[PDB]
Amino acid sequence: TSAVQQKLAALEKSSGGRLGVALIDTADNTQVLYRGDERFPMCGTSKVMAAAAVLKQSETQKQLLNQPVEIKPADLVNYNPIAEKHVNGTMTLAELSAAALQYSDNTAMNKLIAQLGGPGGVTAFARAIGDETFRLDRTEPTLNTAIPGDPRDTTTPRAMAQTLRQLTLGHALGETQRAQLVTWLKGNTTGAASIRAGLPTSWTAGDKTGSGDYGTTNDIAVIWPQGRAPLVLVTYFTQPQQNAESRRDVLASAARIIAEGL
């Protein structure tokens, strides 16, 4: 048990919930894990895998991202800030990817899932890039039930960090596609209270949040510290009761412990 791991355990102790952390410092490829191999509900953090899978398809079905997708009134789910504006019209797969990632639009996510042939199509992409842990089982919004002990729509912090590294800094995607993914993550609108809130102001980052029942509060990020090689950081958090409140502050604290321990 390292000093950083002990600090994360202390944070978890006062948090009321269960915390999972995985850092990969590309300066030396070292990792810092806390409950790194335990499963957590991904919620919206799964949107990165879906968008990346569509980016991979676009490497060979070249005009895929410009392909229109019909948005019907019945497609709308619980949170669709972008899709609702296009009901009875269309959005391209690039628009759907941007909406899913940057606004966490759930209807947009469902269109990515549908393009991939269902939740299993997202899992299939995960397997193709070496992630044997990730599993997407349901569409939005039920993939957010986040029931303790339920393996559906879960992953481990270790697996997600390795995957995010491969996708954003490695070669799981073509160069243009990796750049597009990084651009989308950097333009996220929903992350300032999470991982980012625990980083020095001078650092830059891209991230994708997730939230669900059981006060499930997640964030996965690629970070560029001042004067350092990039980091990949996953912070997952989930609580014992279905109606628990969101705790983005716990993710921010975890990120601060990680930054202070570099």
Ligand X SMILES: CCN1CCN(C(=O)N[C@@H](C(=O)N[C@@H]2C(=O)N3[C@@H]2SC(C)(C)[C@@H]3C(=O)O)c2ccccc2)C(=O)C1=O
The answer to whether 258 and 32 are in contact (CB under 8 A) is yes
Could you give the CA distance from residue 109 to residue 95 in angstroms, rounded to a whole number?
11
Instruction: Print the binding letters for residues 173-202 with ligand X: x by CB under 6 A, - otherwise.
Output: -----------------x------------
Q: Which is nearer to ligand X, 190 or 235 (CB)?
A: 190
N- to C-terminal Cα distance for the chain?
16
- Report if residue 110 touches ligand X, rule: CB under 6 A: no
Of the candidate spans 53-61, 93-101, 139-147, 175-183, the one that interacts with ligand X by CB under 6 A turns out to be 139-147
Answer yes or no whether residue 43 interacts with ligand X by CB under 6 A.
yes
Q: Which of 157, 206, 212, 230 binds ligand X (CB under 6 A)?
A: 212
Q: Provide the token pair at 22.
A: 């995985």
Under rule CB under 6 A, residue 98 binds ligand X: no
Spatial separation of the C-alpha atoms in residues 261 and 39, rounded to whole Å: 24
Q: Which run of H or of E encompasses 213?
A: none
Q: Which is nearer to ligand X, 66 or 189 (CB)?
A: 189
Give the shortest CB-216-to-ligand X separation in angstroms: 7
Task: Return the structure tokens found at 197.
Answer: 């809130």
Neighbours of 9 (CB within 10 A): 13
Binding interface with ligand X (CB under 6 A): 43-44, 78-79, 104, 106, 141-142, 144-145, 190, 209-213
